[PDB]
Amino acid sequence: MNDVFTRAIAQADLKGSFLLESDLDKLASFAKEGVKRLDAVAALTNNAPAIISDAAHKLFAEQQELIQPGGNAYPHRRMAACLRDMEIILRYVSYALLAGDASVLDDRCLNGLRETYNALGTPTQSVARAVQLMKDAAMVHLKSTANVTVGDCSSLYSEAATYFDKAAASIA
Amino acid sequence: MPAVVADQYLAMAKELAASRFGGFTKENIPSPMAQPESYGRDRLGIAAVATENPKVTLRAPFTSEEFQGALYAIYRHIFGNTYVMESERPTTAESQLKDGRITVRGFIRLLAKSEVYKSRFFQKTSQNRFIELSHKLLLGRAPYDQAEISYHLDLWNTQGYDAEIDSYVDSEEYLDFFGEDTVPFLRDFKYQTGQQGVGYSRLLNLYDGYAGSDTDRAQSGQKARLNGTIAQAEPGSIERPSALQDTWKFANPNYRNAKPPMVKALALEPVDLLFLNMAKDLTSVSRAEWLAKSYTQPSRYQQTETFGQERIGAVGAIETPRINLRAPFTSEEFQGALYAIYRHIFGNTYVMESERPTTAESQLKDGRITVRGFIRLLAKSEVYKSRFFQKTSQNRFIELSHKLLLGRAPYDQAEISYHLDLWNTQGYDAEIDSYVDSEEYLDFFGEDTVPYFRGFKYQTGQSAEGFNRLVRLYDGWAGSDTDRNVGGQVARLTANLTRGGSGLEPFIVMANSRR
Amino acid sequence: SRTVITEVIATADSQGRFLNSTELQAAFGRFERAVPAIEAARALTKNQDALVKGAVQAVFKKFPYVTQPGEKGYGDSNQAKCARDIGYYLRFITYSLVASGTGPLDDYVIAGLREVNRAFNLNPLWYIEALNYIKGETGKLLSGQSKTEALLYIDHAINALS
Ligand SMILES: CCC1=C(C)/C(=C/C2=NC(=C\c3[nH]c(/C=C4\NC(=O)[C@H](C)[C@H]4CC)c(C)c3CCC(=O)O)/C(CCC(=O)O)=C2C)NC1=O
Ligand SMILES: CCC1=C(C)/C(=C/C2=NC(=C\c3[nH]c(/C=C4\NC(=O)[C@H](C)[C@H]4CC)c(C)c3CCC(=O)O)/C(CCC(=O)O)=C2C)NC1=O
Ligand SMILES: CCC1=C(C)/C(=C/C2=NC(=C\c3[nH]c(/C=C4\NC(=O)[C@H](C)[C@H]4CC)c(C)c3CCC(=O)O)/C(CCC(=O)O)=C2C)NC1=O
Ligand SMILES: CCC1=C(C)/C(=C/C2=NC(=C\c3[nH]c(/C=C4\NC(=O)[C@H](C)[C@H]4CC)c(C)c3CCC(=O)O)/C(CCC(=O)O)=C2C)NC1=O
Ligand SMILES: CCC1=C(C)/C(=C/C2=NC(=C\c3[nH]c(/C=C4\NC(=O)[C@H](C)[C@H]4CC)c(C)c3CCC(=O)O)/C(CCC(=O)O)=C2C)NC1=O
Ligand SMILES: CCC1=C(C)/C(=C/C2=NC(=C\c3[nH]c(/C=C4\NC(=O)[C@H](C)[C@H]4CC)c(C)c3CCC(=O)O)/C(CCC(=O)O)=C2C)NC1=O
Ligand SMILES: CCC1=C(C)/C(=C/C2=NC(=C\c3[nH]c(/C=C4\NC(=O)[C@H](C)[C@H]4CC)c(C)c3CCC(=O)O)/C(CCC(=O)O)=C2C)NC1=O
Ligand SMILES: CCC1=C(C)/C(=C/C2=NC(=C\c3[nH]c(/C=C4\NC(=O)[C@H](C)[C@H]4CC)c(C)c3CCC(=O)O)/C(CCC(=O)O)=C2C)NC1=O
Numbered sequence: 001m002n003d004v005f006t007r008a009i010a011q012a013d014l015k016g017s018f019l020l021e022s023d024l025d026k027l028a029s030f031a032k033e034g035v036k037r038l039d040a041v042a043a044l045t046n047n048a049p050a051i052i053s054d055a056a057h058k059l060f061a062e063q064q065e066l067i068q069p070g071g072n073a074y075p076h077r078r079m080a081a082c083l084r085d086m087e088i089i090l091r092y093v094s095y096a097l098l099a100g101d102a103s104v105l106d107d108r109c110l111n112g113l114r115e116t117y118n119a120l121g122t123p124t125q126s127v128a129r130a131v132q133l134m135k136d137a138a139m140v141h142l143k144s145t146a147n148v149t150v151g152d153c154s155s156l157y158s159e160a161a162t163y164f165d166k167a168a169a170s171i172a
Numbered sequence: 173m174p175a176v177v178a179d180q181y182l183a184m185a186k187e188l189a190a191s192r193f194g195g196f197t198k199e200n201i202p203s204p205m206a207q208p209e210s211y212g213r214d215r216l217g218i219a220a221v222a223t224e225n226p227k228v229t230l231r232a233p234f235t236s237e238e239f240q241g242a243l244y245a246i247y248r249h250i251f252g253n254t255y256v257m258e259s260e261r262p263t264t265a266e267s268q269l270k271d272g273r274i275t276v277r278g279f280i281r282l283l284a285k286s287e288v289y290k291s292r293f294f295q296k297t298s299q300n301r302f303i304e305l306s307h308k309l310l311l312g313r314a315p316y317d318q319a320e321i322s323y324h325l326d327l328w329n330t331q332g333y334d335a336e337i338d339s340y341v342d343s344e345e346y347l348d349f350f351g352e353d354t355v356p357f358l359r360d361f362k363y364q365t366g367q368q369g370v371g372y373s374r375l376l377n378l379y380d381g382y383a384g385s386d387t388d389r390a391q392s393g394q395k396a397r398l399n400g401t402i403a404q405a406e407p408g409s410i411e412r413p414s415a416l417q418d419t420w421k422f423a424n425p426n427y428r429n430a431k432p433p434m435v436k437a438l439a440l441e442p443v444d445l446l447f448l449n450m451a452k453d454l455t456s457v458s459r460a461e462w463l464a465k466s467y468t469q470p471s472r473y474q475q476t477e478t479f480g481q482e483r484i485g486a487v488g489a490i491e492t493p494r495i496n497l498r499a500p501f502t503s504e505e506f507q508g509a510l511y512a513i514y515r516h517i518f519g520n521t522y523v524m525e526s527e528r529p530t531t532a533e534s535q536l537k538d539g540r541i542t543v544r545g546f547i548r549l550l551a552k553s554e555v556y557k558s559r560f561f562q563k564t565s566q567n568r569f570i571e572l573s574h575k576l577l578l579g580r581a582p583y584d585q586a587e588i589s590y591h592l593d594l595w596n597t598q599g600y601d602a603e604i605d606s607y608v609d610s611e612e613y614l615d616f617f618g619e620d621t622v623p624y625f626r627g628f629k630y631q632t633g634q635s636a637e638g639f640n641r642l643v644r645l646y647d648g649w650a651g652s653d654t655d656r657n658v659g660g661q662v663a664r665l666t667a668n669l670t671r672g673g674s675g676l677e678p679f680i681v682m683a684n685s686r687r
Numbered sequence: 688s689r690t691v692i693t694e695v696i697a698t699a700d701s702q703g704r705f706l707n708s709t710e711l712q713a714a715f716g717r718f719e720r721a722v723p724a725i726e727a728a729r730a731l732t733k734n735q736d737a738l739v740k741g742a743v744q745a746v747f748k749k750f751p752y753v754t755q756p757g758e759k760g761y762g763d764s765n766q767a768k769c770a771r772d773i774g775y776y777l778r779f780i781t782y783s784l785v786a787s788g789t790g791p792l793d794d795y796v797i798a799g800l801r802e803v804n805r806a807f808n809l810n811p812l813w814y815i816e817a818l819n820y821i822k823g824e825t826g827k828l829l830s831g832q833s834k835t836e837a838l839l840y841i842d843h844a845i846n847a848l849s
Contacts, residue, residue: 070203112407
């Protein structure tokens with residue numbers, strides 16, 4: 001697990017010299033925008049139940065075979081497992097968003113997750129769909145301009161989109 | 173009516189539908205993916221070690237059977253699933269456990285330091301294999317990171333074997349999950365607060381089934397199986413043993429997956445994906461937004477709201493303000509109303525300062541006459557007569573007075589006959605009073621509003637030609653009804669009125685048939 | 688369309704006179720108010736999808752019954768038309784904001800509104816609910832004057848519906 005700064009440092013170390021002025025400008029700009037980044041991570045953290053309820057409702061509307069006898073979210077145990085997985089993946093996406101890098105998400109969360117779901121008999125495409133729906137709800141909450149100073153945050157929205165899309169692509 | 177089916181089949185249908193709540197509905201169908209609740213752990217063969225075997229806990233006081241079962245579980249977990257012979261059984265350690273000198277944790281520490289554990293999992297192994305085994309048997313999980321292997325290899329190299337075993341058993345993870353009293357169990361088969369994506373797969377790789385074991389007596393030896401995958405940060409293998417292939421064969425987890433077509437569809441003429449793009453636009457997305465955006469597509473008619481009024485040249489004549497002049501009014505309101513009145517009632521023709529009626533304006537200023545009475549005076553004036561009466565035919569005067577005083581064109585030839593007769597028998601003034609005292613004039617203009625062009629909108633009772641006739645009477649905003657044109661002041665609507673139309677309608681009806 | 692400049696020109700033209708100080712000052716007021724109005728229209732455009740979806744769901748919340756089968760709010764087509772209508776209203780409100788006059792709303796939505804709603808059995812209360820919604824969120828999307836112009840135009844549409 002490394003952030004944007006440790007990523008830059010590792011790339012510099014591989015070639016084996018100091019961080020260039022362009023690299024330091026990039027990282028200083030990142031730290032300057034880190035306040036907006038904190039706002040985005042707070043948006044994901046305070047609205048997790050809303051995001052995951054919305055995603056689950058949409059997912060079991062589109063895919064009814066999941067919540068009906070025989071389905072992979074049928075009894076309370078597997079339904080709870082599904083909502084738990086949604087919580088987990090949202091959590092790691094917010095971690096990566098704070099880090100400014102997707103190393104925590106990939107290394108700690110999504111690495112053996114497709115293998116786990118394949119061994120359990122869980123539709124990885126349904127899981128990816130759930131992550132997409134959860135991305136959409138999360139993006140609704142991130143853009144919220146209430147309680148927070150107004151300003152451009154398009155880079156943050158795009159970055160959160162890449163984190164969710166990477167999660168989906170890794171699962172499916 | 174005779175019975176259509178035999179009663180046995182009716183009974184069978186009734187009792188099939190009786191075992192459903194709601195019988196047979198579309199909402200209460202079984203899932204096509206026919207997975208029991210225990211589908212996953214049964215097909216993986218981990219049902220016993222993950223859900224069925226209880227967590228064995230031993231406290232300070234206990235009976236004989238509790239002690240013996242605890243010992244059986246301990247030996248079946250810590251020593252892998254390998255047969256420990258009676259000569260190998262540790263007696264003093266379990267006497268200390270029985271006394272209460274050591275906890276179950278202390279017993280695990282002793283056993284992992286014993287020659288049984290070392291002979292099985294240390295002396296004929298790599299250190300990688302030893303660390304895998306010790307994570308599995310002592311921490312109930314598999315190593316997550318290569319840093320763990322580096323840490324444990326360095327710890328054994330510097331401080332020895334027992335420091336390694338203590339790092340396992342004294343770890344906060346071991347005490348969080350097992351404390352001092354419950355035997356360690358495989359614990360990454362259920363999600364816990366500190367798990368990682370690779371953990372499930374790697375534990376599955378390390379676990380060889382209930383009848384499998386971690387024995388050095390394999391002909392290939394005691395070999396590491398996670399040494400290459402932990403280094404490369406890969407998941408573990410999820411291939412399960414061969415006796416589980418018959419388990420839950422009829423489940424269809426990959427139900428949503430689409431079967432490919434035998435041949436990709438092409439569109440030879442306009443390119444080779446318009447069918448694929450059409451199918452992605454048809455089914456891949458929900459119907460609601462599909463219709464929503466189809467509704468708001470621009471039309472092939474590129475027609476603004478003023479389109480149609482611009483074509484006939486009547487946008488201004490339609491949108492100009494309606495001047496209403498009350499009894500009390502200011503100078504600006506009065507002069508603007510005068511301007512509007514002279515522009516309409518004199519047909520956009522220039523009236524010089526000498527021709528303007530001062531006495532009539534004064535009477536209107538005082539309130540002696542209304543706007544209607546002013547209009548009546550104006551239309552009786554030599555200005556109006558000389559422009560619209562004296563150098564004209566009566567047809568032109570009648571269409572022109574309709575246009576100027578009613579804001580509409582004649583609707584039929586009966587109006588022409590009526591007005592010609594009225595003027596011929598009573599004179600010009602009576603004929604003007606016919607327009608100004610008409611119910612139409614009072615219902616639309618009514619004593620206070622300047623006349624405006626009414627016939628660009630549908631009027632009740634209109635003849636479907638009065639619109640066309642007002643268009644043919646109107647010459648745009650900069651057109652006038654002057655008598656100073658080269659030919660003179662000549663009629664416009666004589667043939668259309670008398671005929672009642674163009675005379676091409678029967679042939680239009682023919683044309684709308686065959687050809 | 689009836690806007691400040693257009694009514695200026697039309698009133699001067701109806702009296703056949705040039706543009707004097709009164710009308711030039713009205714034009715000046717319009718040109719000064721353009722900045723708040725144009726950036727309010729910018730804000731409303733940027734958030735059209737969320738506003739329309741929220742308005743449709745607000746209509747379904749205040750009028751649950753329409754959602755049931757057999758009446759107006761049922762079916763994919765009917766709800767797509769709800770969304771299209773609410774988008775129409777928002778579009779012409781932004782138009783009026785930009786043009787600094789109720790002209791676009793007057794000529795595109797308000798002229799002929801009652802006849803059309805009556806003919807197609809459309810409740811003005813649905814659209815009033817949607818516009819009250821849009822009003823509520825345009826409150827928090829906008830600050831200062833821009834909020835003011837946006838709400839004058841939204842309330843003009845609401846008053847036209849009632
Ligand atoms: C195997 C055992 C099992 C049970 C028991 C079970 C219950 C259950 N009911 C659900 C939906 C629901 N269930 C209800 C029940 C309410 N309806 C009201 O009329 C009543 C006051 C009340 C019932 C007494 C409602 C309203 C919902 C919809 C909630 C939502 O919006 O998602 C859901 C959410 C998933 C879905 O959308 O279908 C579950 C998991 N699921 C299971 O797998
Ligand atoms: C820290 C990172 C991490 C993650 C994310 C993780 C996920 C995870 N999900 C699991 C089961 C599951 N996961 C799901 C959820 C899926 N199935 C439903 O159909 C949905 C389509 C979909 C969710 C949107 C379900 C239903 C199960 C239970 C399957 C079974 O027990 O047969 C399991 C097996 C153990 C258990 O049942 O608790 C793991 C380890 N584990 C981790 O260590
Ligand atoms: C408790 C952790 C924490 C939070 C929550 C936090 C919020 C925070 N947001 C700020 C400004 C800001 N916040 C944002 C972010 C918003 N812009 C858009 O509306 C987005 C919806 C949204 C983010 C995606 C922006 C653009 C600014 C102005 C730029 C700046 O001052 O840095 C500021 C600087 C003071 C101010 O201008 O008001 C703080 C302290 N800081 C913290 O240390
Ligand atoms: C789920 C219940 C369960 C089963 C079924 C089970 C079977 C089992 N038998 C084993 C060894 C063995 N099994 C046998 C028995 C076979 N060899 C002879 O030829 C006979 C023909 C035949 C028996 C009829 C032998 C000889 C060994 C020892 C192999 C060796 O040490 O080289 C082992 C390896 C344990 C170790 O050596 O540490 C297991 C796991 N264990 C279990 O926990
Ligand atoms: C008990 C018997 C046993 C041994 C000896 C053993 C070797 C071993 N060497 C390791 C790493 C390593 N080994 C080396 C040494 C090599 N690289 C240098 O260039 C040299 C060419 C060469 C030494 C002459 C290095 C540099 C690492 C760290 C690799 C890395 O972090 O990428 C590791 C992983 C732990 C770690 O990353 O620190 C093991 C387990 N494993 C065993 O079970
Ligand atoms: C949309 C606003 C509007 C315009 C523009 C307008 C133009 C206009 N000029 C007219 C007459 C006229 N216009 C002219 C002007 C021409 N004489 C030439 O020497 C010059 C080169 C040229 C002018 C620069 C003249 C001389 C007449 C009188 C024709 C006549 O008395 O026979 C007339 C007929 C009215 C009448 O003759 O009493 C109109 C309608 N009227 C309007 O309501
Ligand atoms: C002020 C200048 C002026 C004149 C004179 C004029 C003539 C005139 N004669 C008309 C009708 C008529 N005119 C006549 C006269 C004919 N009957 C016999 O055939 C004779 C050969 C002939 C007369 C000697 C008749 C019969 C009508 C009735 C129309 C019909 O046939 O329905 C009409 C149509 C309106 C109406 O029916 O009363 C006009 C406008 N128009 C004018 O603007
Ligand atoms: C008494 C007999 C009579 C009739 C029937 C009549 C029709 C008539 N229809 C008109 C406009 C119109 N009529 C229509 C209707 C047509 N366009 C739509 O696309 C449909 C294809 C179609 C109806 C099914 C429309 C849209 C207009 C407005 C066109 C415009 O203002 O540019 C107008 C122009 C005045 C106004 O807009 O109020 C007339 C006079 N007039 C008459 O005096």
